[model samples]
Target: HGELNLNSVPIYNGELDFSDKIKVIGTLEELLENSPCSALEGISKWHKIGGSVKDGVLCILSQDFLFKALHVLLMSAMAESLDLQHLNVEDTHHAVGKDIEDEFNPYTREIIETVLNKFAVQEQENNTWRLRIPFIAQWYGIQALRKYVSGISMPIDEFLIKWKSLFPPFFPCDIDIDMLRGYHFKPTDKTVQYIAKSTLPMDPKERFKVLFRLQSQWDLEDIKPLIEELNSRGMKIDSFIMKYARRKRLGKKTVVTSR
Candidate 1:
């Protein structure tokens, strides 16, 4: 066999270059134990550093470790493949899906499978998928990737409110309040103060529009407080509001608006 000298390469710092045909002399663990500094320091070429020990042989240049790591993390935490209809798409161009199977490495595929098994609760008859976690949480998880990678500290209470916002109208996930508490996601007085302010509209017409939208989705028990809040804000009880009230009084279902 011809000898390969990595050190003679101009890009390498002469540490890893072999003067002769390299043989599988030792395991990576053994090399690390014997010469931890030189062994790791020699692996300076980030692109050429994906090596592993398998079956007592030192296997090198098998895969891109960095690429695999990033793909695994993204797949585990985000990158959901779901029914396009369920997403909040406003245009025809948004209706599309991606098959992640071919793109995933073996390790990344396993991680994605695990995540789907745990969190992809809603399945469609057409074999579509969606996350079990709230959609808002999915967004938040994606946004927070930088923070987690950079090791920045986030406040627990603030995080909990954000987490809670990921459910229902804000997101399509179902997480129990008690379960959040188990994860130390306790709400502060700040959380309580922002609830009505965030959900309700200041403009009367906008408030009515929100109520009309809620009318279609929420039960009377859920919509009652919002209606009361609108009335308290001096928004006159118009036909928009009266329609639901009439439906409730007559024990009939509220009319569903066509898209």
Candidate 2:
């Protein structure tokens, strides 16, 4: 948390990609069709995005890779507050601004945008959206809280929405029954082990099984991160649920059950 160990930094397999000059915009389809297909293991070439340049150009990358990359960034930029929750309401634009100035690494800023905008709760002060970075005690644990959104469960959003102005946005997105629902975390006391759902199976049934293993009623928000890796082509949550799970809403809260 103090200073990131070079050994501890997660390496992007695309070292060559970062070093080379980025191809200027032709079209996204052409970029996908033309770029070098760097396949990993025996898998879909699309699974791990690639090519020459830092990959800021197409913005094509696995969501997992994006989270890891963002981790290195915000961890350094907001390094001082690593001891506790991230305080000192830092501007995300300011945090990654200088990085974007580098043409080779221009995508850093946009990467932060997609990840943060998806998860970072913001304060709308006129036109400026104040960015909040969710700090996880463990590596990539914000994956839990990131999906805990307008995308995620209703309860978490309800709590966050109410706590929005009154509470400073420092709580890590990890879920604990006590920590949520107005429970003030004094810090120094949480040891729940989380197997990041983001890294779970790509198969829909296998993924759902992993989720249902936690609890029978999968809250729509709770299940989003776990099962969405296979959710086809930006499908809406309502339709997505219909395809794979049965949706049952308890009051305004939506939960899904295995079909």
lDDT of 2 by residue, 157-219 (tens): 454443342222453444343323111111112212233454677887777766665556655
The residue-by-residue lDDT of candidate 1 on 166-234, one tens digit each, is 333423345433322111211231221112324467665566465554233433333444455546545
RMSD of 2: 13.1
Total backbone collisions, model 1: 2
Which model scores highest in lDDT? Answer: 2
Q: Which stretches of candidate 1 lie over 4 Å from their true place?
A: 1-108, 122-128, 135-179, 185-188, 191-259
lDDT of 1 at 19: 27
RMSD of each: 21.2, 13.1
